[PDB]
Design a protein around this ligand. Structure first.
Ligand code: HEC
Ligand code: HEC
Ligand code: HEC
Ligand code: HEC
Ligand code: HEC
Ligand code: HEC
Ligand code: HEC
Ligand code: HEC
Ligand code: HEC
Ligand code: HEC
Ligand code: HEC
Ligand code: HEC
Ligand code: HEC
Ligand code: HEC
Ligand SMILES: [Ca+2]
Ligand SMILES: [Ca+2]
Lengths: 520, 259, 520
């Protein structure tokens, strides 16, 4: 049984915590729920930590008083098909392997499944750790609660004796690095300096051995990623997001200065040895658009190359942890502003960006976003109970599972079937354009070896490579983005038509150049 | 937002609560969750209460940290047919009127329905208060959450100006008395002496005017009827039960001394 | 009404039958249920048959006393989509036509459907008889009971006047030969010598005119394929299987000598004119792993070519009826041991194997097989009845239709949805790797004409052809195998990664060789 500690004693040294804790809705929640600080209190001074207190980061620390939210979070949506590869004819990107050739995603890229699995899925995907980590057996893939209890309760490491990234199976990659983990867990929140920069007080950083870092991490999507444990108020903890919104002053809604001001973020910095160490972003309001944008964004979390000179940009560089915080039509400019690209296409040699799940940036400017709707309205609605205390569902899943609460409450003119039909109209239309964009990209890509072998000049190949960048960007955004156009159908339409235009331009350029070589 | 109070100061006078609270699973739960004792602490001595502190008896006091248990409790089972009279050919006792003739149950005795309604159903049944109390309208009969929030949020009193038990409709009875309420609520747990005996410190007792008592009561089946708020440990609070089991030495299982 | 015959009279000459019949559970079942032997008994001698007795091979011969088993067998699973071509984007092998080009399966290869249809489906598939046989009309495709009553009750022959294999429609093949029928029916069990070898007493053999043979055959999957009609004990009748397990001494579980000994097979030979003629394999136990392995295996049942010198191996050769009885990683060695391959790829010219439904060999060594689980546990479980005499369901179908009896009885920790999710995780993962294997095989195949035309040497082409063999084998096993990895997910994973490795090696070899030619 827990025994309370005297928080006044802590507050003597922890003024920032005092100011948060005493004012919020956790003012009566004793520190012992999450911290074991006995030896810390015996040894600390006002500027030196002394013995490190233990801080609980398990979600059960919150589930004791918030079982409803915890249970809704950990529910596994069995209809979210697991380990479903996107590069197949029946999934999101039928020609993905040809289009992404040269990139680590060619090894495996599955559709997302329920949040409980995020950390385990990150660890076991074929592109991440060379196949080092596996579930203990193939039955464990169902065990959401187990994954939440801790990744290492359900996973095995092929070689606990080594800590290097290497292939354990031939068709795997070792793309994982420490930045990835920031969107899977915040178990490292006290051990990682802001942005993963080198820091005396940080156990882990962008340049750490990711296998060793992995072994230290257990829990997915900690509840405190969106809720300050001290004030219980809304926040974000993701460094990349704070950096974009606050440090770079882009604001929470870069396209709406007024909304950015009303629904803003306040950066709170915590120090170690009186030197800035870590930060959180306190939100003005409980704005799930910004909470979900901690992870559902396009980002860099990887080494890459400079657009200017093609030189390597390694994990040690700040750019290896970066939120572009730019919609699809501002993205090329945002990548130019940091002088960065992700990979060279294996066939065309083009410098290309790699886009990932840009839901937050896609949502900006959509009809729903403009009308003050937020992710949670459709994906974590309040529960409707005939007789019950209302709480917010933490199931984070498609509104198809709860259309009454997620759509039909606003769309009184529709039945569930009508609303589903509206969704399907958009997704079907968008998917048709994605498929057409891929057809044209693939047609362009296939001409590169023919052009090279026909003696087409490097100048013409480079012209086509520049078009490839744009054709790729304006296509890939939409296979990366999870709503298949729903979050912003007009933007998807304009973008995908732009992709096709670019590819058609490249096809015509290469075809003409090949024919001119043949004629000469 | 709640501000915690200095529980150690309470414990200077409240040794019994200290021994329960500091040992159980509510040792970290501050008194401010259930008591407003500011003026009490200002005026009390260990021998004089001073200002009476306020104690929350609402189930929301527990639902804050125990929403899953509260929500399962308050759910209304619509399949438990409401206001279904047992003295009919299709219910439990087709000849009940003949057999029970001379007893107040002849006026109305329905099947039970979900616990959320126990106090409101007690107040509105035809045999209890002469028809004095009704739901605010016939729609309110569905409102389990409302009844749990408080009986008087969903009921009306035909005559707030009188406190006597009398018939307001011809075929009703006034069988209710203060003892009934002990199986409907424990909102009176600090205002009722053991067994409802007369007591200088008891606002209410077996001989109280039941209508006046009724008006003071709000919540059905308080969570603390089975769970001690201080220790979080299992308990009962019903005097009649404690009297049988302990005072009369019958034990919890009168047919099984080992159990 | 049947009238019993005096079996003692038969037993005077039929000692093997006496020894089986008098001891088993059919000891009270009179011969007249299945044999009309009146004129036989009048004319036979102890060594000469005299008039041939009639033997009933229709399944109704057993259905009279075993209606429950018969009815469960003949049920048509309408959810098993009929005539569903595998070489489409929504089926098992999207790039099958490119990959299998040169082989008869390019004409048509559908997913399997319910067992009642096996013989009719064999007769009507476009790759088998040149389109000679059709259902009487398109309505008859539903008639499982009709097919079971007899193929010729529901099919028509385009030309009853000729018996040659030829095309009746342009896009058909004539791949059928007599060996195929051994996995469709055993109506010929008394007319076919062991292995289909030439024999004086055999009406049919490997070299027979298959159209004439076809016309003599009526019933699918006779009940006596797994149950000896005389002893009622468990057996197999399939020559290829007996030959692998017993003649070649490979055992029923080639990877487990102990299990092979406990769950073994005893070959029983029957003679004609005191010369070995046909054989059965009596099983030590009712082991469905071995019963189903009569057909659900990789086999040769076709002409092919020698790996050594490329010469034709015709139906007359023993190798035209062969069970490799080898898992995917032992298969290349098993094909080398008989010096055999199936076809030359139409584009690459590579000698290639053709793999078919190797469920039995894939199942070996899997977690379930190692734990003593057998096909029937998942595909023909005992019926569960609140009040009823239990019998074994003969419906032979996916456990999805009976998850309570097929999985959940062993997997108490799971709900049906969890178990289905576990299956889908494996199938989704495996299918993603199949698709990737095909992508790489197709990329390799497409380089062959480019390499040939660029002047790449035969030595380099032959190197790539040798890689093609392996890339093909380690892919095709898994489109052939029906569980999409479920029966052995680790093996599927290792194999498919091997396929991709081989293809990538071939792509790199050919690309480099083409570029070197272009540069010269
Ligand atoms: C000892 C019980 C207890 C623990 C442990 C606890 N909380 Fe709370 N929490 C409360 C109470 C009490 C409230 C106030 C409820 C109210 O009045 O609305 C609260 C309020 C909240 C709110 C609403 C705050 C607001 O401003 O609306 C959030 C979000 C919350 N808690 C999250 C968490 C998270 C995340 C954890 C785990 C780090 C956690 N809590 C741990 C008891 C707890
Ligand atoms: C910590 C980073 C992170 C945060 C914050 C986050 N997500 Fe996710 N989300 C993921 C990852 C990772 C997955 C895929 C998990 C997996 O496949 O194992 C995912 C999956 C999902 C899915 C697919 C679930 C399914 O059934 O397939 C939805 C919908 C989703 N997120 C919505 C949201 C919404 C809405 C928010 C804000 C309330 C949110 N997410 C916050 C990382 C995050
Ligand atoms: C900005 C936050 C963020 C970073 C950094 C991030 N992810 Fe994710 N990850 C997500 C979200 C959101 C999802 C679910 C949406 C989706 O998959 O499209 C996801 C899904 C996944 C999935 C399940 C779907 C799939 O792709 O197979 C895996 C595996 C995964 N991430 C691995 C990685 C690896 C490896 C890294 C580092 C190279 C990484 N993640 C970096 C946010 C992030
Ligand atoms: C991706 C961000 C995110 C994560 C992670 C998160 N929540 Fe929440 N939570 C929300 C949002 C959004 C709301 C509703 C805010 C609003 O509309 O007022 C919410 C509301 C709450 C509330 C207020 C009562 C209610 O239900 O509205 C509690 C308590 C809470 N969450 C607890 C948890 C616990 C416990 C966890 C960990 C299992 C958790 N949250 C994880 C975003 C998050
Ligand atoms: C107006 C409602 C609405 C809002 C607001 C909304 N989405 Fe969605 N979201 C959808 C619909 C509809 C789909 C398609 C789901 C489907 O077809 O089942 C979708 C799909 C998703 C998916 C893929 C889910 C799956 O299972 O395939 C993710 C992840 C997601 N949204 C995240 C977000 C995030 C993060 C935000 C806030 C930036 C957001 N959404 C805003 C309605 C919304
Ligand atoms: C501020 C939050 C909070 C409030 C208010 C609260 N509890 Fe609890 N309760 C807890 C915590 C924390 C535990 C211990 C959970 C654990 O460790 O298992 C707990 C434990 C319990 C247990 C389990 C005790 C045991 O020994 O197993 C019961 C029963 C319980 N509470 C009932 C109540 C009732 C009834 C009320 C209303 C009088 C109430 N609680 C008020 C937080 C609260
Ligand atoms: C405070 C007294 C009290 C306690 C303690 C109590 N009950 Fe009840 N119970 C009632 C009353 C009064 C009703 C009828 C309520 C009504 O009709 O409005 C009832 C109704 C029920 C019903 C019928 C519910 C329905 O759907 O019709 C069941 C079952 C029941 N109780 C079981 C229990 C069990 C089991 C416990 C112990 C966990 C319990 N009760 C504790 C007083 C109580
Ligand atoms: C020992 C505890 C106890 C006492 C005292 C008690 N009840 Fe009840 N009451 C119950 C239980 C338990 C139920 C539900 C089971 C049932 O109705 O059989 C119930 C059900 C009811 C119901 C709904 C069913 C019906 O009979 O119409 C009413 C109304 C009711 N009581 C009124 C009264 C009145 C009036 C008194 C005082 C004369 C009274 N109760 C005294 C325990 C009690
Ligand atoms: C005249 C009725 C009759 C006919 C015809 C008949 N059987 Fe049987 N069969 C029996 C009886 C009686 C048993 C013993 C049942 C028992 O005692 O378990 C039996 C037992 C069996 C058993 C269980 C044997 C064992 O050892 O467990 C199988 C398998 C079987 N029969 C298959 C067949 C097949 C296949 C046919 C058609 C070739 C067939 N039977 C024809 C009556 C019949
Ligand atoms: C005589 C050879 C043969 C034997 C023995 C045999 N099968 Fe089959 N099986 C087939 C053929 C041929 C098909 C496809 C039939 C068709 O498509 O018309 C098939 C189809 C199936 C299917 C797919 C059915 C559907 O609904 O699509 C399953 C499952 C199956 N077999 C399992 C088994 C199991 C388990 C055993 C052992 C109990 C077994 N089979 C024994 C030849 C056989
Ligand atoms: C070793 C036994 C075996 C032999 C020999 C065999 N089959 Fe099959 N056949 C099967 C099994 C098992 C299935 C069902 C599993 C599957 O199709 O993958 C099957 C399925 C079929 C199907 C339905 C699915 C499809 O491919 O369209 C046809 C048609 C078929 N066989 C024709 C043939 C022809 C023609 C031959 C000879 C060239 C042949 N079979 C030889 C066992 C065999
Ligand atoms: C592919 C092999 C196979 C075929 C063909 C087959 N069965 Fe069976 N049969 C089994 C297996 C396996 C069992 C159960 C053996 C065990 O577990 O004891 C079984 C059991 C039996 C039993 C024993 C009683 C029972 O239900 O367990 C009878 C009778 C039987 N089958 C009759 C038939 C009849 C009649 C047919 C033809 C319609 C038939 N079988 C076709 C494999 C076969
Ligand atoms: C532990 C249970 C289990 C065992 C044992 C098992 N399988 Fe399967 N089998 C499966 C599952 C699961 C599938 C995939 C079915 C699905 O996804 O609907 C499958 C698929 C099949 C299919 C394709 C069925 C269809 O409709 O798609 C055939 C044929 C098959 N198995 C035959 C066999 C044979 C022959 C054996 C014995 C050598 C065997 N299986 C052993 C569980 C089993
Ligand atoms: C006769 C009992 C039995 C049956 C039937 C059975 N299993 Fe199993 N299974 C086991 C045991 C023991 C292990 C270890 C295991 C292992 C597994 C594993 C982990 C395997 C691995 O490779 O790590 C999965 C997934 C699984 N079973 C699913 C199923 C599904 C799905 C079915 C139904 C098609 C099923 N099982 C049928 C007993 C059984
Ligand atoms: Ca990116
Ligand atoms: Ca073969």
């Amino acid at each position: 049984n827990l025994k309370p500690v005297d928080a006044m004693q802590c507050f003597d040294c922890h003024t920032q915590i005092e100011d948060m804790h005493t004012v919020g809705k956790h003012a009566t929640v004793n520190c012992v729920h999450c911290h074991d600080a006995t030896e810390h209190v015996e040894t600390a001074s006002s500027r030196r930590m002394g013995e490190r207190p233990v801080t609980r980061m398990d979600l059960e620390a919150c589930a004791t008083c918030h079982t409803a939210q915890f249970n809704s979070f950990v529910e596994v949506r069995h209809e979210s098909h697991p380990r479903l590869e996107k590069a197949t004819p029946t999934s999101r990107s039928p020609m993905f392997d040809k289009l992404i050739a040269g990139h680590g995603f060619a090894f495996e890229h599955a559709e997302p499944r329920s949040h409980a699995f995020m950390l385990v899925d990150h660890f076991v995907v074929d592109r991440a750790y060379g196949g080092r980590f596996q579930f203990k057996n193939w039955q464990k893939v169902t065990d959401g609660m187990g994954a939440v209890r801790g990744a290492w309760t359900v996973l095995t490491d092929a070689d606990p004796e080594s800590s290097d990234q290497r292939r354990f199976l031939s068709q795997t990659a070792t793309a994982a690095n420490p930045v990835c983990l920031n969107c899977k867990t915040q178990d490292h929140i006290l051990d990682w300096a802001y942005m993963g920069d080198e820091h005396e007080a940080a156990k882990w950083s962008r340049t750490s051995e990711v296998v060793e870092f992995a072994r230290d991490l257990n829990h997915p999507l900690n509840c405190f990623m969106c809720h300050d444990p001290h004030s219980a108020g809304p926040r974000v903890v993701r460094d990349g997001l704070i950096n974009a919104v606050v440090d770079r002053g882009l604001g929470t809604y870069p396209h709406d200065p007024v909304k950015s001001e009303q629904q803003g973020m306040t950066k709170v910095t915590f120090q170690r040895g009186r030197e800035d160490f870590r930060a959180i972003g306190l939100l003005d309001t409980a704005d799930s658009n910004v909470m979900c944008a901690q992870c559902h964004v396009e980002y860099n979390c990887n080494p890459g190359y400079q657009l200017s000179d093609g030189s390597r940009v390694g994990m040690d560089d700040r750019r290896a942890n970066h939120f572009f915080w730019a919609n699809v039509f501002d993205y090329k400019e945002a990548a130019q502003e940091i002088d960065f690209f992700d990979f060279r296409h294996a066939t065309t040699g083009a410098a290309l960006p790699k886009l990932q799940h840009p839901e937050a940036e896609t949502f900006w400017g959509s009809v729903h976003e403009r009308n003050g709707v937020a992710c949670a309205d459709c994906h974590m609605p309040k529960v409707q109970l005939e007789n019950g205390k209302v709480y917010t569902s933490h199931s984070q899943r498609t509104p198809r599972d709860m259309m009454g609460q997620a759509c039909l409450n606003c769309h009184a003119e529709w039945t569930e079937d009508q609303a589903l039909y509206a969704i399907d109209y958009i997704k079907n239309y968008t998917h048709g354009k994605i498929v057409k964009s891929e057809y044209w990209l693939a047609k362009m890509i296939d001409l590169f070896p023919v052009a090279k072998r026909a003696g087409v000049s490097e100048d013409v190949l480079n012209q086509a490579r520049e078009l490839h960048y744009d054709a790729h960007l304006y296509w890939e955004w939409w296979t990366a983005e999870n709503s298949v156009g729903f979050h912003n159908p007009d933007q998807a339409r304009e973008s995908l038509m732009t992709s096709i235009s670019k590819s058609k331009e490249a096809v015509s350029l290469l075809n003409d150049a090949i024919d001119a070589q043949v004629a000469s």
